[PDB]
C-alpha cells in the first residue's frame, strides 16, 4: 500500500509537471502561415503481380528499388522507374506480416506468425538468393523489424517484448520489457541511438539502444496504437490509433501538441508517414483511401483515391520524388 | 523501341519472373484449406492423430485425390481480433466439442463451448464460411448420465434420461445458435473410433460446400 501511494504521488508529479509547461498550444501560433492550398497527385506507375493481400513494403536508400510482401509466400524486389522485376524470393511460411530493406542494399529481412525472423543475402557469387540467418526466441508473432547496420537488427513481438539482436552471433544482446500488451510497431531515429514503440495497451514508449532502459511514456489514445512514424528532425513523432485519430507527440516538451481527426471519418488508421520538409502527413485508412494532412494546420482531405480495399501500407522516398501505396486488392501504386 | 541491349535483357528477365509467379498462383488454388478450432482439452489432439497422422502448426494429407491443409493454432496466447482476419479465405472451420463435460464446472464446459461457438458463427469475416461440428466422448457421457441426468445443468430439459434423447437435445441446442440460417449451414457428427468415418464425413461436407459455391457463383 505504501508503494501504491508513492506511485500515485509520482504519477501526480508527472501530471502536474506536464501541466506546468502549457504556456501556449501549437494551433494558436501557426494560424498565420500560408497553407498548402490544394494538392493534387496522379498515378505514374502501377505494379502488378502479387495475387493475395499485401501486408508491407519498404523503400531502398537509392530511391529506385523497392521490396514488398504478401500472403502468397513471396517477396518481390521491383525497379520503380521501368516497373521491372529484379528479384522474386519464395518464403518457408506464408503467414508474413512485415519486411525491411538493408541500408547498404545487401540484405533483406522478414517475419510472421511462426515467431522467427529470417535474413537473406542478395549479393552472392552463385547468382541466387540465400537465407543467411534465422533469429528465434520470441513466444509471439512478429510485428516489425528494422536494420541498424549490416550486423545489428531490432524486433518487436506480440508477447510484450522487444529485442536487439547481433546477427553474426545469432543470440540476443539486450531485451526491452514494460508493456502490458502486444507491441504493434517501431521506428528508428536518424542517428540510430533511440527508438519508439506503441502497444495494444494504448501507450507508447521511448527506448535507448546501448544501455537498455525505457525513458519516456506517451499516453492519450482511446484504443490500441496501430502505426507509428518519426519526424525527420529527430525531436518529435506521430501516432495513429484505431479510434480514427492521429496525434503528434514531442520528445522534449513531454506532452501532446496536435490531433488530426475529422467528423466524416469513422474508421481506424493502418499507416502513417511524413514528407521531406515536414509539411505533409500521409495516412492510410480503412475507408479504402489514403489521405493527406497539413502537419502545421491539422486540416485537409486531399484524398489519393483509387484503391478497392483497405490501404495496408505506404511510404515516401529518401529525396521526396514519389509516394508508394499498397492495399488489400493486390496492386501497388506510385504517385507523384 | 529505343531501349539499349541491356534494357532488353532486363525486360526478358522480368517477363520470365512474371511467368513463374503466375504458374505458382495457378497451383496454389487447387487445394483445400481448413482452420481447426476447439476449447480447453476439447480432445482436438485425437482428431489430429486419427486423420492421416511454436506458432502455427500445419498438417497436410491427401484423400481421394484432394489435398487438405489443416491449420492448428492453439499456441497463440493473444486475443483473436489481432489475429483472425488472416484466415478470411478459408474453405471451412472444423470445430471440436466434448460431450462428457456437462457436469465439470470450472459454470460448466458446455457453456464455454456454446459461448465460443456463438462468437465464431456470427463473425463478420465468416459471413459465408461453413462449420463442421464434432461431438466427442459419447461413451463416458452415456455412463455418466446413468447417475446424473442433464437436469444438473439443463433444468428446463423435459425428456427421459437415456442416450439418444439427450444426444439429440444437445445437438439441437448447439445448432440453434446459428443466426445466418439462409447463408451457411452447420454439419454435425458423433465421433466414431473404429474406422475412417471421421475423414469421410469431412470429405462429404467439403464436396457439398464446393458444389454450392459453384452454383452460387453463376447467379443461378
Amino acid at each position: 500500500d505504501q508503494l501504491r501511494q508513492e506511485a500515485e504521488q509520482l504519477k501526480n508529479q508527472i501530471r502536474d509537471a506536464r501541466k506546468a509547461c502549457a504556456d501556449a498550444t501549437l494551433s494558436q501560433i501557426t494560424n498565420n502561415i500560408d497553407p498548402v492550398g490544394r494538392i493534387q497527385m496522379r498515378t505514374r506507375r502501377t505494379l502488378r503481380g502479387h495475387l493475395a493481400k499485401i501486408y508491407a513494403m519498404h523503400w531502398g536508400t537509392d530511391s529506385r528499388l523497392l521490396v514488398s510482401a504478401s500472403q502468397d509466400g513471396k517477396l518481390i524486389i521491383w525497379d520503380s522507374y521501368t516497373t521491372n522485376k529484379v528479384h522474386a524470393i519464395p518464403l518457408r511460411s506464408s503467414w508474413v506480416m512485415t519486411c525491411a530493406y538493408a541500408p547498404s542494399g545487401n540484405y533483406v529481412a522478414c517475419g510472421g506468425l511462426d515467431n522467427i525472423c529470417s535474413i537473406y543475402n542478395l549479393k552472392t557469387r552463385e547468382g541466387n538468393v540465400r537465407v543467411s540467418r534465422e533469429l528465434a526466441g520470441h513466444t509471439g508473432y512478429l510485428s516489425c523489424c528494422r536494420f541498424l547496420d549490416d550486423n545489428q537488427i531490432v524486433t518487436s513481438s506480440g508477447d510484450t517484448t522487444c529485442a536487439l539482436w547481433d546477427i553474426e552471433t545469432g543470440q540476443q544482446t539486450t531485451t526491452f520489457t514494460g508493456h502490458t500488451g502486444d507491441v504493434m510497431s517501431l521506428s528508428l531515429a536518424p542517428d540510430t541511438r533511440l527508438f519508439v514503440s506503441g502497444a495494444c495497451d494504448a501507450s507508447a514508449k521511448l527506448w535507448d539502444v546501448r544501455e537498455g532502459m525505457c525513458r519516456q511514456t506517451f499516453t492519450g489514445h482511446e484504443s490500441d496504437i496501430n502505426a507509428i512514424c518519426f519526424f525527420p528532425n529527430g525531436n518529435a513523432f506521430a501516432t495513429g490509433s484505431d479510434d480514427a485519430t492521429c496525434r503528434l507527440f514531442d520528445l522534449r516538451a513531454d506532452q501532446e501538441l496536435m490531433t488530426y481527426s475529422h467528423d466524416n471519418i469513422i474508421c481506424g488508421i493502418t499507416s502513417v508517414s511524413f514528407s521531406k520538409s515536414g509539411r505533409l502527413l500521409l495516412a492510410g485508412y480503412d475507408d479504402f483511401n489514403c489521405n493527406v494532412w497539413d502537419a502545421l494546420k491539422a486540416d485537409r482531405a486531399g484524398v489519393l483515391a483509387g484503391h478497392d480495399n483497405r490501404v495496408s501500407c505506404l511510404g515516401v522516398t529518401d529525396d521526396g520524388m514519389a509516394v508508394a501505396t499498397g492495399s488489400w486488392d493486390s496492386f501497388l501504386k506510385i504517385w507523384n | 523501341c529505343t531501349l539499349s541491349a541491356e534494357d532488353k535483357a532486363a525486360v526478358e528477365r522480368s517477363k520470365m519472373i512474371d511467368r513463374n509467379l503466375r504458374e505458382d498462383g495457378e497451383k496454389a488454388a487447387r487445394e483445400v484449406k481448413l482452420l481447426l478450432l476447439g476449447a480447453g482439452e476439447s480432445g482436438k489432439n485425437t482428431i489430429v492423430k486419427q486423420m492421416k497422422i511454436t506458432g502455427i502448426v500445419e498438417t497436410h494429407f491427401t484423400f481421394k485425390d484432394l489435398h487438405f491443409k489443416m491449420f492448428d493454432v492453439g499456441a497463440q496466447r493473444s486475443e483473436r481480433k489481432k489475429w483472425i482476419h488472416c484466415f478470411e479465405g478459408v474453405t471451412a472451420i472444423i470445430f471440436c466439442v466434448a460431450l462428457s463435460d456437462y457436469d465439470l464446472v470450472l459454470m460448466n464446459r458446455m457453456h464455454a463451448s456454446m459461448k465460443l461457438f456463438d462468437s465464431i458463427c456470427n463473425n463478420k469475416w465468416f459471413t459465408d464460411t461453413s462449420i463442421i461440428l464434432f461431438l466427442n466422448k459419447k461413451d463416458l457421457f452415456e455412463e455418466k448420465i446413468k447417475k446424473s441426468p442433464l437436469t444438473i445443468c439443463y433444468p428446463e430439459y423435459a425428456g427421459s434420461n437415456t442416450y439418444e434423447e439427450a444426444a439429440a437435445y444437445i445437438q439441437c441446442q448447439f445448432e440453434d445458435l446459428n443466426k445466418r440460417k439462409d447463408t451457411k449451414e452447420i454439419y454435425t457428427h458423433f465421433t466414431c473410433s473404429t474406422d475412417t468415418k471421421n475423414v469421410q464425413f469431412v470429405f462429404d461436407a467439403v464436396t457439398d460446400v464446393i458444389i454450392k459455391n459453384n452454383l452460387k457463383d453463376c447467379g443461378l
Partner: single-chain antibody, 228 residues
Framework: VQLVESGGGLVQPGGSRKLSCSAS????????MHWVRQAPEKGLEWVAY????????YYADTVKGRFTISRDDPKNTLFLQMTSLRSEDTAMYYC??????????????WGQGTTLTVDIVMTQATSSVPVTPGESVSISCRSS???????????LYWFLQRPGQSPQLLIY???NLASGVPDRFSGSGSGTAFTLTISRLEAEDVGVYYC?????????FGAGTKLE
C-alpha cells in the same frame, strides 16, 4: 565457381567441329553466355551470344550461317557448332558469363579457353609502354561515336590479361570497379575518348589491357596495350 570447356584441336579444310563447356558451382540456368575469340597473334574478337531462356541469339557478321550456339540446362552444358572451317578460324576460344538486371556486373567470370587450329570502332593509341615500379601510368583509347546513352550509362569496359592466363574484368561501364580487384585502378574520360589510370605499380601487374564497347551488337575490341 568454375567453367571448364573442351573440344579444341587441329582440323583440315572443310569439316565441322563442336566445342562444349561445363559449368559447376553456380546457377547456370540464370546466366547469359558468350563465346569470344582471340587470334594467335592479335587481339580479341567477339563471336556469339545466347541469353537466359534461349529466346535470343546473336552472331557476328563474319560467322553467321556457319556457326550455331546451344545450351542444355538439366546437365549445365553449352555447345558451339562450327561448319566448313577455313584458315581464318584459327584461334583460342573463351566461354564467358554475364547477367543483366538493374545494377549487375557482366563479363566478370571467364573460362580458360581452348585452342582451335586449322560498326563502331575503338582505337588503342599505343602498342607498348616501358615504365618502372613505383610510378603511376595511364592508358588511353578512342572511339568513333558517342557511347553515352540517353538513360545515363556509358557502355565502356576495361579488361586485363597477364602472361599465360585468361582475362579478368577490371572496370565495367567506364567508372565502376569489380569485386576482388585492388582499389588502385581507375578509369574516366568523356564521349569518344577514355583513359584508364594505375597508381603505385607493383609486380604481377604486367601484360595487355583491352577496352571494349557494348552499346549495340556487334561488340568490338581494340588492338591491346602492352605494359611491361
Amino acid at each position: 565457381v568454375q567453367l571448364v570447356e573442351s573440344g579444341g584441336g587441329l582440323v583440315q579444310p572443310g569439316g565441322s567441329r563442336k566445342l562444349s563447356c561445363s559449368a559447376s558451382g553456380f546457377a547456370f540456368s540464370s546466366f547469359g553466355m558468350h563465346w569470344v575469340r582471340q587470334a594467335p597473334e592479335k587481339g580479341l574478337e567477339w563471336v556469339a551470344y545466347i541469353s537466359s531462356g534461349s529466346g535470343t541469339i546473336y552472331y557476328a557478321d563474319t560467322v553467321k550461317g556457319r556457326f550455331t550456339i546451344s545450351r542444355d540446362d538439366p546437365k549445365n552444358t553449352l555447345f558451339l557448332q562450327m561448319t566448313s572451317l577455313r584458315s581464318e578460324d584459327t584461334a583460342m576460344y573463351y566461354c564467358v558469363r554475364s547477367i543483366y538486371y538493374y545494377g549487375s556486373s557482366p563479363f566478370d567470370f571467364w573460362g580458360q579457353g581452348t585452342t582451335l587450329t586449322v560498326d563502331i570502332v575503338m582505337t588503342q593509341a599505343t602498342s607498348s609502354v616501358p615504365v618502372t615500379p613505383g610510378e603511376s601510368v595511364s592508358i588511353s583509347c578512342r572511339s568513333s561515336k558517342s557511347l553515352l546513352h540517353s538513360n545515363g550509362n556509358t557502355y565502356l569496359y576495361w579488361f586485363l590479361q597477364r602472361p599465360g592466363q585468361s582475362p579478368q574484368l577490371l572496370i565495367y561501364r567506364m567508372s565502376n570497379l569489380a569485386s576482388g580487384v585492388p582499389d588502385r585502378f581507375s578509369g574516366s574520360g568523356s564521349g569518344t575518348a577514355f583513359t584508364l589510370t594505375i597508381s603505385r605499380l607493383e609486380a604481377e601487374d604486367v601484360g595487355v589491357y583491352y577496352c571494349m564497347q557494348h552499346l549495340e551488337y556487334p561488340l568490338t575490341f581494340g588492338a591491346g596495350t602492352k605494359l611491361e
